[PDB]
C-alpha cells in the first residue's frame, strides 16, 4: 500500500500517464533485465535498453533467439532486433516488435555515460 499523499492509485491517471509519456520517460519505461552472467559481472539487475546492445528473447514465439538491437521504436513502445523478423514469399521482411521486459541483455554497449550509469547504480565493472 502507498503511504505518500503525492502518489496516485487512480487507474485512469496511471494509464493516461503511460500513454502520453514523452520520449525521455519512455526510455526509462523501456528497461530490460540483464542476464545471469552480466548480473554477476556488473552487480546490477536491469538497465534502460539502447540501440547497440545484444539481447536474448525469453518469452513469446521467438523465444531462444539472439541478436543485436536494431532500433528502439519508442513511439510504439517496442524494440526491433535485426535477426528477429517475419518473412513473406515475395521477399518482404518485417521486423518483430518486441517488448524489452520480455528480453534479456547478454552484451552491453559501453560508453562513458553508460559506465557512469552503472557506477552510480552500484556497479563494479572490471
Amino acid at each position: 500500500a502507498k503511504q505518500s499523499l503525492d502518489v496516485s492509485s487512480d487507474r485512469r491517471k496511471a494509464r493516461k500517464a503511460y500513454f502520453t509519456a514523452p520520449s525521455s520517460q519512455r526510455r526509462v519505461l523501456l528497461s530490460a533485465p540483464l542476464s545471469k552472467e552480466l548480473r554477476a559481472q556488473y552487480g546490477i539487475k536491469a538497465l534502460p535498453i539502447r540501440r547497440d546492445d545484444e539481447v536474448l528473447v525469453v518469452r513469446g514465439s521467438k523465444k531462444g533467439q539472439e541478436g543485436k538491437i536494431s532500433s528502439v521504436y519508442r513511439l510504439k513502445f517496442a524494440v526491433q532486433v535485426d535477426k528477429v523478423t517475419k518473412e513473406k514469399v515475395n521477399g518482404a521482411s518485417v521486423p518483430i516488435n518486441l517488448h524489452p521486459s520480455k528480453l534479456v541483455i547478454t552484451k552491453l554497449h559501453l560508453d562513458k555515460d553508460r559506465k557512469a550509469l552503472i557506477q552510480r547504480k552500484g556497479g563494479k565493472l572490471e
Partner: protein
Amino acid sequence: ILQESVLNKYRTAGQIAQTALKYVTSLINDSYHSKTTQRQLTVPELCLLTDSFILTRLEQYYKNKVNERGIAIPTTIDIDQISGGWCPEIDDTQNLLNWNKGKDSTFASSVTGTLRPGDLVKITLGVHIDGYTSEVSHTMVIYPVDETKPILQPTGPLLGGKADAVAAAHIAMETVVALLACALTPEKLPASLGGTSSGITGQLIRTIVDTIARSYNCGVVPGSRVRRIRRFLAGQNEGIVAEREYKGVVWTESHQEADLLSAIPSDDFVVQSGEVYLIDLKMASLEHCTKKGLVTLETVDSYTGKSHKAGELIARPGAYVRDFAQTHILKLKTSRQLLTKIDKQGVYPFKLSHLSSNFPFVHENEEELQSLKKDLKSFRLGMSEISNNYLCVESPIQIARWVPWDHILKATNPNGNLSYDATSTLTLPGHELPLPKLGVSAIKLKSLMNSTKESISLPVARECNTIVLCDSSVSTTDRPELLRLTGGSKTCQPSWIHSQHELNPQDSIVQGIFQLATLAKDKRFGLLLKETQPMKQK
C-alpha cells in the same frame, strides 16, 4: 548482311575513331607528361577539341553519298571512381567549382578539370557513318614526370588496386578478342576451354571474364557487355532506350548474386560469321574491400541540398538523348529551333555544343569560343523547356560503389518485390530488380548503400573495342579473320603498371586463355587479327 560497302563504312568510322583517340592521347601527354605546353588542357576543353577534330575529319569522307553521319558517343573522360557519363560542357566550370565548394578532395580532378598523378583517365568515343558504328575506349594512367633522366619517362609504374584493375581489363579485352576470333575457326579452340565441335557462347565469355577478374581481385562493373551491333542499333544508349532483339552477355547485380550463390539478354547464343560485335569491359578494384560485397552504381544529381555528405560529387550531365516517340509543341521559339536541330542530329546522344552552327571551329579563336558560349546560354534556355516536357532525357553520371553483403542480409524491407521508385523519370532503371532472389529493388538498394558507413567507392578501368568477323569472301586473303575496327597495339597501348596478382596456371580456363594467347601471337597457323590503322595527321 555484310557487304563491301558496309565493311568500308565500318572501316572508315573506325579509322576516324582511332585518329581521334591518338589525338587525345597526344594532347594529354603534351599537357601533363611532356609538359612542353604553356597552358594545361582541362577535361571539358579536351572533350570539345576532340569532338571538333572528329567532325572536321568526318566532313571530308562520304560527302553527298550518305544520309546520316556524325559522332556516335560524345567524347567522355572519366576519372577513377567515375564509371561514365562525364562529358561536361565548357560553360559549367564555375558551376562545378561553386557546387563543390565545401566538399572533400576526392573528386578534385573532375571538379577542377585538371588531372593529377596516379589518376586512371578513361577516354571513350565513337563514330557512326550511315548508322554503322565503331566505338573505342581506353584507360590510361597519369604519372609524375622524372627530372634526372634526359628523356621524359615516369618515375615508376602504377602500383596497387588501380594496376590490378588496368591489368584485368586489358587481359580480358585481349582474351575476348582471341576467343571471338576462334568462332571463325572453331577447330582451333583449345580442348579444355571448350569443345572442338562446340562454338563460342556467352557462357564461355562470362566464365573467362569472371576468371580473370577473380584472379586480379576485381569485380565486373554492372555496365559491361559483349554484344552484337547492327545498323543504328549499337547500344549507344543502353540504359535508356529499349531494344526489340538483343544478342549478347551482360553483367548485373543479379549476376553477382547468382555467382555468389553458385529484350532480356541471355547467354544462349552462338557467335556467327559476318557480324559486328562490341566488347565493353569495366573492371572495379576491390583492394580496400576487406569483406565480400556487391558492386553497384550511384547516380549524380546537381542538388547540393539533398544531404550533408562531404564525399559526394555534385554535377550535371552534359549529354542528352532525344526520345522520338514523344511529341509536344513547345511554347518558346528558341525551344522550337533547338528541337529542330536536335531532330537533325539523329538517334545518337548529343551535346548542346554539338548543335551550334559555329562548332566545329575552323580556327581555334577566343572569339570563336565566346560565340559558342553565347549560343550555349540560349541553348540552355531552350533545353529546360524541351526536357520539362519529356522530349529529351539525360544520360546519367554514375559512380561505382561497393555495398557489403552483411548489411544487405541484415536489412529488412517490408515491401519486397513490390517497391519501386515512382518518381524516377526513366522507366527502364526505375522498374528494376537488382536482386531477384532476395526481393531487393533498386530504391531499396540505393537506400542501403546510402545508409551504410562501409559503402565505399571503387576505382574503375575501361577497355572497349569493336570487331567484325570477316568471312572468306569478305576478307581480302580468302580466309576468315577478325577485323578490329578500333583498339589494339597502336592506340590502346597499355601504360606502365605492375600488379602483385597473376593468373594461376593450375586452372583449365587459365590454360585455355594461355593457349589463345599463343594462337594469337602465331600469325601463320593460328588466329588472324587484322587491326585498323589510324590515318596520318602531320
